[PDB]
Amino acid sequence: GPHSLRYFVTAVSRPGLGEPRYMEVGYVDDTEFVRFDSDAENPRYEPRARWMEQEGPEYWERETQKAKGNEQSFRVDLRTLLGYYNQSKGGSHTIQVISGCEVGSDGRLLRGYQQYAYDGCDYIALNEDLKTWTAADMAALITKHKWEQAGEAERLRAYLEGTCVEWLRRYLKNGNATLLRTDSPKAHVTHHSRPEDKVTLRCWALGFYPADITLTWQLNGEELIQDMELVETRPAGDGTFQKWASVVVPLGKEQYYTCHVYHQGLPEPLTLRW
């Protein structure tokens, strides 16, 4: 299937409390694999997945230096943005970036991306063609113009089409036992009373990887996507994921409702009842 390499970068100013907090967190697919946190005692890039032990000391030194360089760029950015937006020095502000690439099953590029936000709002984003940016406001337009004159899109495109893809392929190779595995969901239904002659039926899916899954409730062959409550798929502390979906049904009619679970680890989807 396709695979992705994503970095989530965050810089947060803290006036009166020193330098901004700066973090990078990397993922291959749904698996955290590297991190940098400026608030650590001696900040360094660190592995977060066992298979990253296959990188030698030079990797950790080089990526640490890169993170420190990035940290400095985001420190300057926080100051610059106060200027662009005419904001005071006393408030905390946040820059966020998502950056990465996706490849198909054959290792060839499907898409690249890099998007920024300031205080939780879109700022600037690389267009799908990897050649130009789109700016959400007049501050971001200043950035776009600077980056255009400096040749930044060419540098970024070279990273996305080249470096990013090559690293992703290597991580998939090294981490194959973890990243190319499938852990099948195990499912069950819980039941809870309500006021009025109704009951809540909750369908759980546990222990699965990758994270993509579909849970539905049906009555009479029809899916009840409207009547359902659910939680976003969530990590469970060991590299697997979980999810639940519930419906409210009439007391005594529980038998007519079925939960359906679709996942890459389920050759035939699961069907279950309370």
Binding site: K66, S73, T80, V97
Partner: peptide
């Protein structure tokens, strides 16, 4: 490996 960012 992440990108090496430049100032905005």
């Amino acid at each position: 490996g992440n990108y090496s960012f430049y100032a905005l």
